[PDB]
Amino acid sequence: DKVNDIVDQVITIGKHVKGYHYIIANLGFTDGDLLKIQFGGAEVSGFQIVDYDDSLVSKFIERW
Amino acid sequence: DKVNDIVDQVITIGKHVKGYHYIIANLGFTDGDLLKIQFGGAEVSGFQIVDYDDSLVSKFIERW
């Protein structure tokens, strides 16, 4: 939650363009909305614990 | 309406930063939302037919 608030502020002040580099320090990188700071230009990195490429997880989502 | 759609797209692609100059070709410059491309950096100009500085208009708004 606190991440989306910051990300929103970042876009407002325009500090999401090429030159900036953000690192989301949590296990849910794809858990938040990234479509906003995705085309900004600034590189964004993070961590993902739930690999949606695993057939195990992929099957879970199919029912979820 | 078509202006807000464009303005929104402009902010998304980030073409609202310093260096760009937009001119809203209508008689309602303050009729649309400008708070979005206001802090972007790009200069925005337009036209206003309803002068809210006139005591005549100012009185109208007081009741409106």
UniProtKB/Swiss-Prot annotation, chains A, B:
Tissue and organ expression note: Detected in forebrain. Detected in dendrites of neuronal cells. Expressed in the pyramidal cell layers of CA1 and CA3 and in the granule cell layer of the dentate gyrus.
Glycosylation sites: E43
Processing after translation: Palmitoylated. Depalmitoylated upon L-glutamate stimulation.
Miscellaneous comment as given in the Swiss-Prot or TrEMBL entry: The postsynaptic actions of L-glutamate are mediated by a variety of receptors that are named according to their selective agonists. This receptor binds AMPA (quisqualate) > L-glutamate > kainate.
Summary of subunit composition and partner proteins: Homotetramer or heterotetramer of pore-forming glutamate receptor subunits. Tetramers may be formed by the dimerization of dimers. May interact with MPP4. Forms a ternary complex with GRIP1 and CSPG4. Interacts with ATAD1 in an ATP-dependent manner. ATAD1-catalyzed ATP hydrolysis disrupts binding to ATAD1 and to GRIP1 and leads to AMPAR complex disassembly. Interacts with GRIP2. Interacts with GRIP1. Interacts with NSF via its C-terminus. Interacts with CACNG2, PICK1 and GRIP2. Interacts with GRIA1 and SYNDIG1. Part of a complex containing GRIA2, NSF and NAPA and/or NAPB.
Entry function: Ionotropic glutamate receptor that functions as a ligand-gated cation channel, gated by L-glutamate and glutamatergic agonists such as alpha-amino-3-hydroxy-5-methyl-4-isoxazolepropionic acid (AMPA), quisqualic acid, and kainic acid. L-glutamate acts as an excitatory neurotransmitter at many synapses in the central nervous system and plays an important role in fast excitatory synaptic transmission.
Protein name per UniProt: Glutamate receptor 2
Gene name of the encoded protein: Gria2
Entire protein: shown range: 214 to 277 of 883
